[PDB]
Amino acid sequence: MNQASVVANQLIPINTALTLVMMRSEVVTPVGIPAEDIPRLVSMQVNRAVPLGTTLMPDMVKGYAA
């Protein structure tokens, strides 16, 4: 209950460096990268196109580890 994940606020194209305008948060299931990790994600690249409204998962971000 109430646990938020990072959700794409825009289509995020492949190999694009994440910016704050790209990353909303929402309480969804399954649970993705926690919202609190957004600062860590800024400037990291996604390794695939991430459609609008997709929950961002650990395997979608180059080099990401919690």
Count of domains for the chain: 1
d(CA 6, CA 56): 6
For the residues of 1-56, what is the DSSP string, one character each? ----EEEESS-B-TT-B--GGGEEEE--SS--SBGGGHHHHTTPBBSS-B-TTPBP
Do 48 and 60 meet the contact criterion of CB atoms below 8 Å apart? yes
State which approach was used to obtain the coordinates.
X-ray
Q: What is the CATH number of the domain that holds 50?
A: 3.90.1210.10
Tell me, in Å, the resolution of the deposited structure.
1.1
Which residue range(s) make up the domain with 52? 1-66
